[PDB]
Symmetry: D2
Subunit: 238 residues, 4 copies
């Protein structure tokens, strides 16, 4: 009646055997997780890459009415040669363990037109279902976010992300901070993990570059820490 | 060289030998840290309470060029009988280890209006607009002054549980504070560049401070429901 | 330059996605990891079971000269209908990520009689030709023949608490067993060079076998498990 | 209903505001916790030193039926100029929060035969056979007495680093202590059934105590090199 898992990497090892790389994703010799293709130092169009931690995570348990609380921190960089033409974005996500890459472009490698996936997206291009401004969105089994906050993307600057899920209140909270100019953004939503996802999931990142040559950008993850605890609800708190 | 300290309480024992209680602060029989006085269910005016963890925390070290990264989470409630008349607020803070209560009211038990500056870094949840404050209720980052270096407007929800997370990243000197109300999934965040080495001594105590208003009609509670803290002092 | 991984289960979930079950191993409805076969309440002969955590662990890195330090705790029970006829044993181990079951019987599902990379701490209940006469706790480096052991007073059906630690800076592997029922304990340590014994990445877990005769039978059940490893640069300023 | 505390130091800062130093204990300029006096490079007789973590630890609560489980690890050295004449030893201990140094010499700064009312639970690394001791140097588990409830013979290695791990499993009341010399891969262990609720008050301080001999020729250092402690007080399962 307690299961706890954590991991933390201050950079990635170039051939990381505890990370499942999908699509174009790779780790560079200097330990950056380059989700979308970069060639000759330029980001390339029509790229999709994802990365998952090797172990599935026990996020809820039907036989005991436990639901996990979790938290994750990571830093990422999106750098674009043209700040007026950026696409498509990067996300943190949870999905069934055998999850594969879904539709490219605006679907971020996570969703499709035709899917259980919960995601926090950092969305750089306004699709038909998006607000006009770049945004941080919380997504539950749809590319259309259930709640978002407008996001002032800073080209090429390190973004520090912290995401937490409080099982007792069903509250998912996502924040981004730029240390370069000490500016931050936050959004929360009420999210029921038990109805959106299966009992076991893999967790990780997904990103796509645009579907035209002139809307390109990198989606690089520099470090990552994750913890989840599946335990019985407390009867005495408040 | 690494020095790591962590503590977590899902609620407080009523006689907590690892918390230094100052002023009016107490723990209720149900395990809530009641910073400011409550009589017959009503919050009382002219109250000041603080609470510090017993062990000092090593936040920087001159000889080895180290500065700590830290993070803290807690939940709190501020409950007012009259939503239009609320004072003064609650704060999480770091101060020298022998820190004692400082001025009441708008000074939140943390600062004062004398010539002598005080070493204290705080994140304040401010319910009352003093001369030095913005008009709205706000979350502020305060570095050795009751006047915040940076703040965000705050939609205070009367009697609702607020979840706070505060982190400090030594490598970029970035302090970030967030508040979320799970009851309506609404959140607020503010960050600031803060140099701990210039603002504080090498060792500090950490905890909470709160004050109620200096008029009988401007009263509210300042209760902390749980608390987790971790700090790591390690080489750059 | 730091990679840290930790997991802890107070009992196992009956269909555990984050455990790779091999051979006969299964988790019971009450959350026990039953490595070797039990039919109608009795342990069965010629059984081999193993179980590994799903994530590979980064135990050394050629590029930076880091070597991990790790610790693991677990509780286990070995229960036998006949105390004078026990075989073969249970082990905690580290092996390459694609590790598969190896020889049964005295080989504990880990080694064979053929070059195998596996480091193990074994709780050995039957004296093979390479064993001391008494039951024992052994530290094993790429061989079924232990590099060091301590004689072990096995208590039939009682919970045994194990603690194993590896201190990279001294290459010291330490293994202990305590029975809380009688407050009795056993310990053994060895100097083990993980870099030369194993690949950079490994999987970790348990292996056990029952006897190769109908009458030498006993359970090998694990009740909980915690593990933590840290791969970081060596400390330059400690003692 | 959970209270968790953890701290770790890879070496001690020279003016450690989170450690209460008592008696002769000091931290050297290189970060070693030197519990007993050293003068001109030589350990001095009639010395007693102790050190406690600044925050009290909540080890049981009557109202909720909780008892803590804890674990601690540390390395230490005991170095003697004359291997045939060693005294008195070093210990890890738990005591009431306002604990003060008790008798010197064989009482390890922890106990006193005059007063059996002392509350203190300890794991001792005992280098000198007193009247209440076995003959050999030994690792002992002591509960409100200098006379160990359980011990194991200990092959002390002069001036070598010893790695200690101690754990307390609340649900079975099992206290387990182990010592390992990395230098020769040699280890010792002992366990005991210990009821913390009847031995100690609800809140304690934790740390170390040591003493050097009560004669000029029985002298040895008692230095702690690091430390890591965790305790969790939570509902019984
Ligand atoms: O330009 C970036 C966007 O491309 C969109 O796809 C467009 C594409 O850009 C255009 O050249 C033509 O092929 O029509 C496509 C419609 O599918 C993506 O939908 C959008 O996400 C951006 O990546
Ligand atoms: O009403 C809440 C505020 O009280 C202020 O104190 C005032 C007080 O309101 C007024 O009655 C006067 O007589 O005394 C004080 C003016 O010096 C506090 O200064 C302010 O922080 C609020 O708490
Ligand atoms: O009886 C338990 C031991 O069996 C040994 O295998 C024996 C087997 O028992 C015997 O019937 C005959 O087949 O010879 C085999 C090999 O000598 C295992 O080697 C030993 O590990 C025990 O399990
Ligand atoms: O020599 C070390 C031990 O001294 C013991 O005390 C002795 C003392 O050495 C001696 O002078 C004698 O006359 O009486 C004392 C009691 O036997 C300590 O008791 C012992 O703990 C060591 O320190
Ligand atoms: Ca989009
Ligand atoms: Ca104010
Ligand atoms: Ca054998
Ligand atoms: Ca003695
Ligand atoms: Mn979007
Ligand atoms: Mn203010
Ligand atoms: Mn053997
Ligand atoms: Mn003794």
């Amino acid at each position: 009646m307690s299961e706890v898992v954590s991991f933390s990497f201050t950079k990635f090892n170039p051939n990381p055997k505890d990370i499942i790389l999908q699509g174009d994703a790779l780790v560079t010799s200097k330990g950056k997780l380059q989700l979308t293709k970069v060639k000759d130092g330029k980001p390339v169009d029509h790229s999709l890459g994802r990365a998952l931690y090797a172990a599935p995570i026990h996020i809820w348990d039907d036989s005991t009415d436990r639901v996990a609380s979790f938290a994750t921190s990571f830093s990422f960089v999106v750098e674009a040669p043209d700040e007026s033409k950026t696409a498509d974005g990067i996300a943190f996500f949870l999905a069934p363990p055998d999850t594969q890459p879904q539709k490219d472009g605006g679907f971020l490698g996570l969703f499709n037109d035709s899917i259980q996936t919960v995601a926090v997206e950092f969305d750089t291009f306004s699709n038909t279902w998006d607000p006009s401004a770049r945004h941080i969105g919380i997504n539950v089994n749809s590319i259309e976010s259930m709640k978002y906050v407008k996001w002032g993307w800073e080209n090429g600057k390190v973004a520090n992300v912290y995401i937490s899920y409080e099982a007792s209140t069903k509250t998912l909270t996502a924040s981004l901070t730029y240390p370069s100019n000490a500016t931050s953004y936050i959004v929360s939503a009420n999210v029921d993990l038990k109805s959106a996802l299966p009992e076991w999931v893999r967790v990780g990142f997904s990103a796509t570059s645009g579907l035209s040559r002139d809307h390109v950008e990198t989606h690089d993850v520099l470090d990552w820490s994750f913890t989840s605890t599946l335990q019985a609800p407390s009867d005495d708190s408040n």
